[PDB]
Amino acid sequence: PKEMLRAQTNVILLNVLKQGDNYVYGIIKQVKEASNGEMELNEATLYTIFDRLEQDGIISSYAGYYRLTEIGHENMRLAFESWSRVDKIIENLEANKK
Template identity: 40%
Template structure:
């Protein structure tokens, strides 16, 4: 999972795909390192995506048809860019919405005021 001191593994589990899909939805095409840097930046350093979590997920999303890839030569190496497929775009939208409504619901549930009796 991600390297993260503030949140438990249980809480973060399942959010990685949502984050990756939403980032690609906002940025068009991105490569692996760029994604880790962007997550670090957006979370102000709180969330650090480990390579060990990111790359398996990217490959899985690609195999499932959510992402398409293209390779570009950079210096003496190849850079692999990821981009959402139409299916991936739909899923990004769905996952983000689901997560938003989930957090809103959690907010309501946890925001219980003591009953005035």
């Protein structure tokens, strides 16, 4: 579901800017590497995908290039915390056995 791809993409992006400030191609590469070629990145598509995040306010663009914002780190710390809880809830359902 295209809905759920873009979800998965954004998280890869953000986890890259997390590790350091990076630019289009330097991101693609790092993903290519880390995916083990597995992640066919797309030069045409990272436009729209990076506007909506600066537009939302989680990402900044300075000239040499992108950085993770005050907000940004929060909205992940949130998401990673809440989804981790969900993992534990799912373990306990497997443990409830029902």
